[PDB]
Amino acid sequence: EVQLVESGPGLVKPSETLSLSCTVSGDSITSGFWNWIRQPPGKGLEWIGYIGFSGSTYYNPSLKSRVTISRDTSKNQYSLKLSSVTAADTAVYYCASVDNSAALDYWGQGTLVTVSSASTKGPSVFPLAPSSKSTSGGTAALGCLVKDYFPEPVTVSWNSGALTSGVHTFPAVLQSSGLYSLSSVVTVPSSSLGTQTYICNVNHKPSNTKVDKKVEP
């Protein structure tokens, strides 16, 4: 089954150069049409364009001739370049295949690109320790506060992905400082504290931050 993966920088300065690439697995891009779509924040979807059979392309006129799509068939990759970006170009960018029905049948997970003149900044990670102030009946809650990073996103897992039950990772909030902050929390049995070890695994790719924080009472 076809798989698509977007990659590229998560931060671009206004007026500078947006470049992303999509690596396709399970199919060859030398046949069929391959697409870029974007979605601005809490906004809906906009088709950007495709690259098709002979390297031919079509771009949505909405992009006003700022876009170029190209391919590297030897690596089964295709790429997007968007020039003279502004805040309006801040979005999650997806690559996707088209089928014979002309629908978008397989999509990548997408990658967020933020257009800003602010600098890259990695988060500090703090424990939200379980206590009598977070224990009711038999249940306790604990977590990690991921503070002061830019741009989005941060990824959080617990115990290297072993713990998924009861986990809530909240949307990031943009602080007045212009830096994001988020919390991930988990509800666990009070009876499990001191018996089980809980570690939040935090990843901020745009700053190369990778942190594992043990959370204890």
């Binding site: 809650a141 506060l145 949307p171």
Partner: protein, 217 residues
Amino acid sequence: DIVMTQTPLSLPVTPGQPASISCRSSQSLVHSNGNTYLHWYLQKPGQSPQLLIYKVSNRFSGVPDRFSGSGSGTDFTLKISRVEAEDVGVYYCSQSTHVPWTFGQGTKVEIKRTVAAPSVFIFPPSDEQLKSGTASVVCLLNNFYPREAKVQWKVDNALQSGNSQESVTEQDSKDSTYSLSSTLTLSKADYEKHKVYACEVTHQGLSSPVTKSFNRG
């Protein structure tokens, strides 16, 4: 551009009840080859859009039988005969007949489950963060419904304002609840000046407003 337009934009529905979404295009989507390239996508919480229906009425892979599409020319409908908790997310109609391909605004389907009171937890700042000269106090409201919830911070019984932010999860695709985290941020010096920290929560599922608090030290 063919303008695709969707109604309603927000669609609350009780589990087991039918739901319908109307999609209009500004021009006929009948292609000269005789096909009608109208499609529907579903974007579930925290993931990429996925193809639901193609060519108006054709169900894509793994799409449960409860979903059906109909219509012709410029007037289309998506019907869910009995909604399930897993159907929560944003539904988009889209046209492929003419370039550029375009999408509707998206319809947010919300599941109207039973009222559930939040479990409330409070977390003092970590001594790790207190080093840094800042203090984040976190209030957690877990697994509640409906979304409407009021949180207010009180420090030594003093109403706080302008020093807190909230984040709330998307409705859970399994239990249809929301969770919310509210963070109160002070300087270390300020935090060190006061004694009782409290978050008072108001919600339909509570018998009265609930307050969780702690004494500094």
